[PDB]
Point group: D2
Chain length 522, copies 4
Amino acid sequence: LTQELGTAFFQQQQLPAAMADTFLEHLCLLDIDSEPVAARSTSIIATIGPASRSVERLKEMIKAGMNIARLNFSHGSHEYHAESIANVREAVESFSPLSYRPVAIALDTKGPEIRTGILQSEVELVKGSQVLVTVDPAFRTRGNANTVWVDYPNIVRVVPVGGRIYIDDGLISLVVQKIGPEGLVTQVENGGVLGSRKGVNLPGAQVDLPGLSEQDVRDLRFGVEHGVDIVFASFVRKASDVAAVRAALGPEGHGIKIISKIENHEGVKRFDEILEVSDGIMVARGDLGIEIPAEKVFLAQKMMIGRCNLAGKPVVCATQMLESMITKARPTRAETSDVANAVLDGADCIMLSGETAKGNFPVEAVKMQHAIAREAEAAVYHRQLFEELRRAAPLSRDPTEVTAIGAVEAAFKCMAAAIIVLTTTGRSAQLLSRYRPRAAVIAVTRSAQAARQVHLCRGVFPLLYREPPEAIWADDVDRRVQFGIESGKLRGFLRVGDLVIVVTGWRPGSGYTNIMRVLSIS
Amino acid sequence: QELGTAFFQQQQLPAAMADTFLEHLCLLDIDSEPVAARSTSIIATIGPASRSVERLKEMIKAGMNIARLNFSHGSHEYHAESIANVREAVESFAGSPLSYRPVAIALDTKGPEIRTEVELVKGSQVLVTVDPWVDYPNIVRVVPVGGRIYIDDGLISLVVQKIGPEGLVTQVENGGVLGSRKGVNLPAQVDLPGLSEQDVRDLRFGVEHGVDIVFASFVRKASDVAAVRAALGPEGHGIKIISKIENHEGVKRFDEILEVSDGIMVARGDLGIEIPAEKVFLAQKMMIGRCNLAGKPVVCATQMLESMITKARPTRAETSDVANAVLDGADCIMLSGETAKGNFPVEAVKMQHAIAREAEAAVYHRQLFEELRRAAPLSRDPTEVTAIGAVEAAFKCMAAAIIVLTTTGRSAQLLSRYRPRAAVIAVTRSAQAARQVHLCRGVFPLLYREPPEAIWADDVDRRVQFGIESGKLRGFLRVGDLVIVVTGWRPGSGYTNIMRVLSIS
Amino acid sequence: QLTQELGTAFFQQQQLPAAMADTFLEHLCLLDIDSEPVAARSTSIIATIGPASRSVERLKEMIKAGMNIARLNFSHGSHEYHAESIANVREAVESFSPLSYRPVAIALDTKGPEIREVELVDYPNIIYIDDGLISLVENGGVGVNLPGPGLSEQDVRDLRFGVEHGVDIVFASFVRKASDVAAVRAALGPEGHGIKIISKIENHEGVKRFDEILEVSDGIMVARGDLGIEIPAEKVFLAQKMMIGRCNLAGKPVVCATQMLESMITKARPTRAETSDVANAVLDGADCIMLSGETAKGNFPVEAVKMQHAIAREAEAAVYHRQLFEELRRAAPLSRDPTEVTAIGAVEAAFKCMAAAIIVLTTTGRSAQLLSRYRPRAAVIAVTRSAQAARQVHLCRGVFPLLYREPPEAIWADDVDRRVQFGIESGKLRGFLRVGDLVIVVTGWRPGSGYTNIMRVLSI
Amino acid sequence: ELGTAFFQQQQLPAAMADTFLEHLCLLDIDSEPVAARSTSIIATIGPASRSVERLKEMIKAGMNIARLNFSHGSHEYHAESIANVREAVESFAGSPLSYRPVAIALDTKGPEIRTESEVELVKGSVLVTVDPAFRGNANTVWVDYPNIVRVVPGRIYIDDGLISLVVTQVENGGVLGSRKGVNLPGAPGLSEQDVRDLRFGVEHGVDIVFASFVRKASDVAAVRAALGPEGHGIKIISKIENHEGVKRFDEILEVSDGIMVARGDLGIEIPAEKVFLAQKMMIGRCNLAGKPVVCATQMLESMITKARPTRAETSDVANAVLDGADCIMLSGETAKGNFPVEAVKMQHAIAREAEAAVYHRQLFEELRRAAPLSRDPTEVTAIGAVEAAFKCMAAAIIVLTTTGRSAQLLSRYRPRAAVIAVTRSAQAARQVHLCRGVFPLLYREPPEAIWADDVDRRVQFGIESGKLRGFLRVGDLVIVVTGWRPGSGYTNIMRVLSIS
Ligand SMILES: O=P(O)(O)OC[C@H]1O[C@](O)(COP(=O)(O)O)[C@@H](O)[C@@H]1O
Ligand SMILES: O=P(O)(O)OC[C@H]1O[C@](O)(COP(=O)(O)O)[C@@H](O)[C@@H]1O
Ligand SMILES: O=P(O)(O)OC[C@H]1O[C@](O)(COP(=O)(O)O)[C@@H](O)[C@@H]1O
Ligand SMILES: [Mn+2]
């Protein structure tokens, strides 16, 4: 034993469960009185909307743990989103270099959306009643309790008699009874309050929408123009869908990370080819749980998180994680469970939508995800996870890859408080994070954009280094390492007496990481 | 491999053969359809939405296995009617002995409940008084300054500022809109009796009405379980006691509670107010793990498909929660408001059924069996020895079922504790044992109604054949399947000691 | 734990503390020289017959010391010589209650393509000599091997002689390929179809074509002597461990052979390397271990047999069943064969309750063999009416054959029961079983081989 | 991954196996060893191996440690053996890049009891007498242990336990020679003689002491005291040779630098068939503790008179390596036999094959688990370096070390990569031979003015010596382990380098 740290120390952070010999025994030893210690490592994405646009609200959200701001281009004009970007940047800047928190900005594309029209504000579609789905432009604004208009003309051709049409998060359901010149005549399977311009899903259908629409292209170029850090690409179904996105971003947008949203059957089945050309993945559960049966989504989520973990690429879990918090101050027991299990599954990021975009408790929702993620991360059975990742990852002659596993192994040996890594592009930090160390990965960089983008990786804490280079390079390295230490002390990551692992390289420029050193904090 | 090319793509079998848990997850396939019968039992709570005989018939057909009676509300007369209705619905299917589904009835006690539309402003001062306000006098004694009072599923909170003869004077920590007769939680030293006067009458009622199970509220320690068992008396010796773990003490004193209980319920509603909400998953996963290890039923409860009270489809987190409770190892999953009072009680049961079926197929048996087998203690008890032997055998040949004759359910429970992929088909003459075994994942009770053969060995064979016949009718078994048959060497319970490998003809 | 009521002394024996360790390394760290073996020795001992062990009286002492299989080395001696050896073994075996009768197998070891006092400073189609001592580089010093023919005429004649005298096993010398095994099976003829064929792997080609050879063989011998000349001596252990592993996986007997206790040819006690070599052969997973010169011509034949027995017993207790069972289990394929399914259920069950034995009824040995392959700690007590199957199952580790002599009862179920009781009484007398023990009993649903499908848990 | 041929060698196909059983099944006689032989070879000095000419051939054959058996020979005899070893070793010092440090170990006589007509003891029929007037016949046995009468009353073993007695009757008879070893299983510390032998050892700069019949921790403290202040840097290897040593193993290992499984005596003191249990146990616990362990006695016994070993002897050598022995030893085979050099070459050939057959996947996982957390930077750097070496199939781990300790901490994890240890301490270079897979390079140049330059220069020496010896080739990856300041105990850096 080691009374160097204290008896108390080994009772915290689920350490008694960490040393179990089987997963089952690990579960049996989890302890509600064992308090988390490590800094929360899972990234929190918060969607911007009326409830979170204010600069003052955004500062509270950043303080609560928001790492990435999501702009939902399904709604709002370019000017609206420009203002969103503006407020985030002002919140971020209006807080010492040692305490600065970068926040990334992600553009979530509209994609192949089918939507109903504006009624003549709320109507009801009685169960059993008959409703006409029309593409007749005359009925564009003539929507009512028996007549639904949709903005997808070819719908009348892709939905056969008997086919189903979902409206508003798949809540309203219609089954096609008769196809005619006027449109699909259907019977309301499940009724409800239909509003204006609601989402439509055609599960079985062979939808013929572009994939990257003319609008999407304009939105993406807007993103490049305003320096967004990440793009969440909607309805990615194949490698060529990601190429389209890359192309639309152009020469100037080559540094933007592409996270492919998997939202339908084809995307799940062509996952491998998609992950191969993407920077990361979003499990987009909203559309996915309508496009495939709701009861199969967890299988897709667990499979996708697993393959991303193997590949060392960021994966996001999204949609309805704390839904009830849109109107209530506390989440349901299923929602807390869902956040915790997403972390335990292996997610790099978890996301909030309505909860922060439009609900009454946006800051509370961020705080709740932070509290859950922190408990969950301590409950991860590193013994099994590290060993399985280690044995699956392939032999490597890349010195950055070799140094990373050595560093994470070393960290586990001494209960390192942190691994401090210098990085130009984020990569050295990324290859560390993929082994899921318990130690915080403190990444020191001069690239403001890499500092934002690295928030996609679990357990990476970016520090933006602002000072001009020293005349002597080895001196410049050492100074950044010290910046990382002093930042970590300030933020409560590090204490005098802690051991850290320090990861650097042998020459300037990206790609030369090759050194690990074991340092005591003084 | 042999005799099935399409067979090995289904039921997540490609993932089943994975060499590591990570590779197993990576191999899960949305196109791999479940084959096995759904094995996790579904508990539905009876209420206005699910109390009529016609609605109960639809719920039985949708998959409900246990009917829960919530004694926090309703008179004895009301509950007697609920029970009569469940029994009427259940026996409406009795005409088909081969296709008949036993349904258990569980009485969920009221327990030590404390109760109280105007809005409580935050920062303001509210007056808590037991002067004819909460229905619990000693509240003004068990709360020290700066201690916390939760009201209304923990949505509203208060801290004590002044302790006076007019009551407890408190400010509003978390404000909200109050209401009437709303639940109060005090996370601290409540003296409220382990078992109230009302609780004792309710348990007597349960016994007089032949309930199969008691869910005991707020079990804190072994002695609370003994009090329930005393209250049930000699007439109720056969009733299973499931201890509800709902607060910090219960979680801490879990082992002693488990040792004297028949099983456990993770009562996440109160638990999530009594301890911080973000810790409940830790308690859930730990309690399920320990129950699996001990071979005792564990129930996951509360708010699993909450939004289906008003919506036709659940949220993404709700489906995830159900699937993960099954993957955690829960024997049963539960529905409350979703069936008691909601607009979609039958749809709620059907959704749990569909999710559980998918989740069950995703279980990584290779690791689970190895870990349960190893952690379990050597035993010279023939029923335990036979069970592990039978489960090993079923795994070896991908048996369609293990058919077991049981008087008390015990031989079936012992099979269940190892999580076979094979369905455990339990043939019994005991109506009550047939109902109670629903507490065990993957046990499918068949009630045998024929009087004994003169020759005991012939009577055993008839019952095994009954097992096979119902199995075929229900789609558990088909010609060319292998089954494991578990029996005993003499009549009477406790003598199970034989397993046989049979081909279905 | 709870079963501590079976004794605190009980769980300190047969390396049980090492048994429950969670890693192999921890298992080694817990091996304990004061933890005494309990189970009957399970690895079979094969003793070569020669001038030191022809005596009926000597053979009786050897059977008593633990010899299970008598090996006739047809590399030397006329047919009449071997017929006399066979005669003596049989008379020793028979001149001993049916409850204690120990069957002894007889194996014929073929001569093979052999090639045969100065101080060097018969194959016409014509370089090591004398056990590879002299070569070749060039190691002049005081039997020839050419690392760079087939089923001889003599071999064919010997094999026919083997069938005439009802030998139980053939060890086929220098098997290099599947067709070599077919030639042996041919020479044995219709009348020899029941004789077990153990292929001797003795050169490079045989090691390289191991898989196809094992597929058509009943088992394998690691013939160290020629092997260690045909390939570099320092590579033999690799061949041995590989072949033993694959036979284990396949569930077919494998024999380790050759200089296992060599020094005991002239000395009363073996060397430290020798005791180590025997224990490691058992730990590797060998079904049988063999003695050659040690029993054929040496001065301490009975002592050699006793020494292998003593070492084997200690080493079997030291097997890390946790890992072995798991690995065999995970490696063996799903099976719809009821005997296979029953066998794994019985061994699991035996492990659950620390069964004293698994008692199995068998006609051909098969049911006992499929139990054997999972390497249970419990003794496999196999009851058979076939005297030949009773001898042949000595090839399988952990199988104790009992030869049942009574004619069948009128009611088959009764005859089954009677044989099960025969197993129990035999096991009691021999000290396998004690009142209060649990045994696993494995039987079948109809008479005749191939219908094993039942496992029962019984207390004595 | 360059070359399908590369992955056929060094039992790599078996290395990748998912279970131990499958690893065994994949072992391949055609898969040639690549790595340098890593298990250390101890040869005993005797008439067959004493001359400078023979010792040179022995060094070339692979002897790493010369053992001096103080059970026989005078101080003058052993001083000559030491001088001879040193002359032979320094005959190669002219090539700093390819020179092989050889350790000298003193093996104490210990509490030995001894008894050329050669009479015969007939079974069933003997007088065990200490009457000092006997110089012994077919019924008369005199022993140099006066207290024998009081202590035994009970079996008495003579001559490597070949003869036994139970005044006594013969239980196991045989020919009895002159002055034979006597064993008394089931009940004097350090000899006045042992004390002089140890003082002699220190005065002659021996590197290691093999202490005979260590029964408990105090026996080791006694050796340490006898070595005194000038002998503080000498490694103490405790010989476990009887029942009490085995039962008190843990307390002995705690205070020892290492262990020898002395199978000769152990095989007489406890039943012969139990020794393998003692061996595998002791090796496991030493591997666990990260301390060297030696397997000894009769490993290639027949080679005393034969040019080639038996099949059991080769198996014994290979299994000792597979068990986890850091060192293997030859006694009579080199001290007095006809083929001392051939014995050394044979252990080298076998060890090399066995090392390739080690299932690192499981071994590294198990050693890593069972090992305790450490906040010692040398221990933390070592596991990170070994993990990194495994990740890239590094050809070597080059480590700078003053005392050998940083190299030892690398060795305890059993890397496949050779541990090339560069040191200025001649004695540390000899002493690291006790650790499997450490290859000591003695660096002889005076310190650079600038310490960082001196460090770099020594790493380069490491690389150049490595290329000459065949450890390293252009395009290989190496892990370099160094420290942040001069002096022992400051190792804290690992670097991944390409060999140009
Ligand atoms: O993670 P990346 O992008 O590969 O960058 C790591 C690089 O950072 C460094 O530590 C220092 O680089 P700079 O001085 O150019 O910022 C290099 O040694 C190393 O190659
Ligand atoms: O699981 P339980 O309750 O112990 O009952 C198992 C019992 O069932 C039997 O198979 C048949 O018993 P009955 O004929 O008395 O119903 C017995 O052989 C065995 O002891
Ligand atoms: O293994 P040891 O005995 O602790 O020696 C390692 C030492 O060698 C060094 O690498 C160099 O030390 P020197 O320059 O003093 O030889 C140190 O940085 C380190 O502390
Ligand atoms: Mn979507």
